[PDB]
Each structure stands twice: as C-alpha cells, then as structure tokens.
C-alpha cells in the first residue's frame, strides 16, 4: 500500500510543472485524494482535494487559478498541474489519501507519499563563496567558529573540518534557499578557547555540481 | 481556521509524560487530527476525530478535546517518539489547516549564544551577512541595528539531534554593504522565557 510522487525538480519562475502520484495496493477510485506541501520554514500547507470520481475539486487560495488537480482512476494516478510557479511554491509536495469514512464528513489523512521536491529558482549552477565566522575572546564554556557557505546552486554541499579529523562539536545547518534563488548554509564548531593560538581550523566545502572545492582557514581577529 | 500549537519545542527524556496542546481559532467540534513527523519522512497519522487512535498506533498515545481546545498525551515517552507533532483541523466549510507543530526533543550541554560580524572578505563582495548562533537552547530571534528592529531580512535554521544530543539554531541577517557601513551597533536578541539575552558588537571594533 503506497503512494509514490514524481515529476519534481528545478523549474524557472513563471514556468509550469506537472507532478504525478502513482497509487497502489488499495481501491484508489473509492478514495478522495489531496496534495499537501511543506517548506522547511513554514509547516504543512494544504493545496488541493479531488473527489473519488473527479466530480469535485477545491484549492487553497495561494494556488487558486494556477494549480489544477486531476485523477485517472484507470491508471490509479493523481496529478497536480502547477502553472505560473513562484519562488514561494518551493516545497516538498506530498500526495495524500483521506482516511476512509462513511456518513457525511471527510476524515484525517491516513496515507502519505514520501514527497517530491520542487525548487522554483531562476539560477544556474554556481559554486559557493566561503567566508570565515571568526572566533574571539567567548561565553558558554567554549569558543565558537564556523564557515559561511553562501550563494551556491543546486544542492548539495558537503562540509568537513580539518579534512574529517575534527568531528566533535561540529554542527552543519540545512541549506536555506535565499530570495536570490541561491542556497546558503553555515557550519559551526565549538572549540576550547585556549586552542585558538595552537590548533588551526580549516573547513572543507565540496560542491559536486560545480566541481568546486573550497578550503578556508578560520582564525581569530584582533 | 488558524491552529495554534504552544510551545513550538519541548525537551523531555525517555519515560516522561508529555502533553501537547492545540488551540483552534473557532469551534471545530471534534474534526481534529494529530500527526507525528520525523526529519526527511512523511507525517504519520496518530489520532483522528480528536480522540480515536489510528490502527497500529501504540496505546501510549491518546487525544482529547472538543471545540477549540485539544491535547495529545504521550503517557511515557519512548526513544522513537522524538519528532514533530502537528494538529490539523478538517471542520465543515473550513478546508484543511495545520498547527505549526511542537518538536519534542531529547534533553541536553551548556547553553551559549555567539554573534559573528561579516568578514571583511565578504564585505568586498558588496554583501554583509551577520550570523547569530544559538547552542543547546531554543526561542519562542530579534535583530536590532542601532535599536532599529529588523524585519524581512533575516533567515533561521536549526540542526537535528543525533547520537550527544547537542543542537544549534542560527539566524542570518542579510544586508547590503552600504547599509552595513551606515550603522554602529549590531545586536542579536533571543528570548527563552521569564529570559532574553542580547549579544552585540560595534562595527569596526
């Protein structure tokens, strides 16, 4: 029993994208079906519903007039046609089945796909710039330093420290898609304050898509 | 119908009793569902019709409430229960809306807060990024630039607990270099509860 979405990827703003969802293992034509989306920075947002027989459709205001939901009960597929895509439609899109019920009311969402990611960005491939987040002399039991990995596309970058030798204290954040259509993230590490003059710190950023590797030595200021 | 979940995040240990609250801005009768979501995975249905347990969901999960006030209770938390829990209304003529979630996370190191000025290196590029780093500690963060409250030019992100259980939150304030040279005091203020801490620096010092 499963729902499997497809069709996501990178799409330019204004352009169009069709998602599909293949349902199997249940009587698909007897079920109402939904699309729900999720950005990292907002939670879950409902998108559209379609009746078991295609006879009623409803949309969220944010997508009304630009998205079309449809279904093929012969091939057991749900689809979402997304026209005039904006940067703010960037999200994981989930195909979602309603929990079956009798009587007059709908029910909760009992079966979800794994989701397909659509990234609305006019950007081209581009390796990152790496800027130090320099430590100083300081409060919390430890010092803190990092690398700011800015303006790259697409995902992912990988971040290591001292070529993998420094692992404890390392926190690398998820990338955020900036308004510019480019990603950025930071990798930080908490280190003892006394070692600022002794242990040199180097973050390693590898950006496979652009065949770029940056090694940045992070040292304090004065 | 706006769904409100407070708090947004909550520390607990294996074994604790956990109660999550969900308030609805209008009566929704019992048309309320709770989901659990872990990173990188789809939400999973726990409770429907505000108190009915979904098939196969273990009995330590229970829900109650009607009208505008609902709760989800975990009688004794287990190691696979650290997750984000969402409530969602499906009331007549109300479409479908979700709370913003309560992230239940595993307790604990020492809280700390750091602020990083833009590097002179990035300044050459005409852009200035100001980074505020929070460790082992979570708000709800406000940026002040010469006491001027900032809006719309900051982004936040958080890491995930893994094998210990340290976590961090970052706020990145993004400014043109011109705007950055036009100010002296840059401050990052973050409030936990009754409490605020403000790390700052003076440009060029």
């Amino acid at each position: 029993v499963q729902l499997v979405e497809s069709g996501g990827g990178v799409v330019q703003p204004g352009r169009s994208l069709r998602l599909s969802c293949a349902a199997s293992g249940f009587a698909f034509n007897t079920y109402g079906m939904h699309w729900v989306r999720q950005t990292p920075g907002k939670g879950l947002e409902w998108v559209a519903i379609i009746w078991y027989d295609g006879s009623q459709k409803y949309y969220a205001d944010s997508v009304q007039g630009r998205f079309i939901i449809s279904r093929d009960n012969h091939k057991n597929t749900l689809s979402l046609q997304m026209n005039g895509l904006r940067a703010e439609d960037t999200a994981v899109y989930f195909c979602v089945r309603v929990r079956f019920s009798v009587g007059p009311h709908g029910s909760a969402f009992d079966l979800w796909g794994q989701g397909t990611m659509v990234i609305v960005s006019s950007a081209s491939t581009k390796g990152p710039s790496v800027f130090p987040l320099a430590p100083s002399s300081t409060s919390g039991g430890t010092a803190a330093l990092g690398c700011l990995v800015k303006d790259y596309f697409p995902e992912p970058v990988t971040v290591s420290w001292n070529s993998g030798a420094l692992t404890s204290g390392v926190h690398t954040f998820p990338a955020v898609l900036q308004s510019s259509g480019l990603y950025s993230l930071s990798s930080v590490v908490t280190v003892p304050s006394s070692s600022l003059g002794t242990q040199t710190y180097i973050c390693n950023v590898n950006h496979k898509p652009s065949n770029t590797k940056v090694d940045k030595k992070v040292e304090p200021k004065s | 119908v706006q769904m409100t979940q407070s708090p947004s995040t909550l520390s607990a240990s294996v074994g604790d009793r956990v109660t999550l609250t969900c308030r609805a801005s209008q009566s929704i009768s019992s048309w309320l569902a709770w989901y659990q979501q872990k990173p990188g995975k789809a939400p999973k249905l726990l409770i429907y019709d505000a108190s009915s347990l979904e098939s196969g969901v273990p009995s330590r999960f229970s829900g109650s409430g009607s009208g505008t006030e609902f709760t989800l209770t975990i009688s004794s938390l287990q190691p696979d229960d650290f997750a984000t829990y969402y409530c969602q209304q499906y009331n007549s003529y109300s479409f479908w809306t979700f709370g913003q979630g309560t992230k239940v996370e595993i307790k604990r190191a020492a809280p700390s807060v750091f602020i990083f000025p833009p590097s002179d290196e990035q300044l050459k590029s005409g852009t200035a990024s100001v980074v505020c780093l929070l460790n082992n500690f979570y708000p709800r963060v406000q940026w002040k630039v010469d006491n001027a409250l900032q809006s719309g030019n900051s982004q936040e992100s958080v890491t995930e607990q893994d094998s210990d259980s340290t976590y961090s939150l970052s706020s990145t304030l993004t400014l043109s270099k011109a705007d950055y040279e036009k100010h002296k005091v840059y401050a990052c203020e973050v409030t936990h509860q009754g409490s605020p801490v403000t790390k700052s620096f003076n440009r060029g010092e």
Binding site: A27, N29, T30, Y31, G32, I49, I50, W51, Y52, D53, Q56, Y58, V98, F100, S101, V102, G103, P104, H105, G106 | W31, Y90, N91, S92, Y93, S94, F95, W96
Partner: peptide
C-alpha cells in the same frame, strides 16, 4: 460540510 464533506465512494 461542502469541501469537507465525505469525498469517498
């Protein structure tokens, strides 16, 4: 319930 009415067979 209109949009929220039972959408199933």
């Amino acid at each position: 319930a209109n949009p929220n009415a039972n959408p199933n067979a």
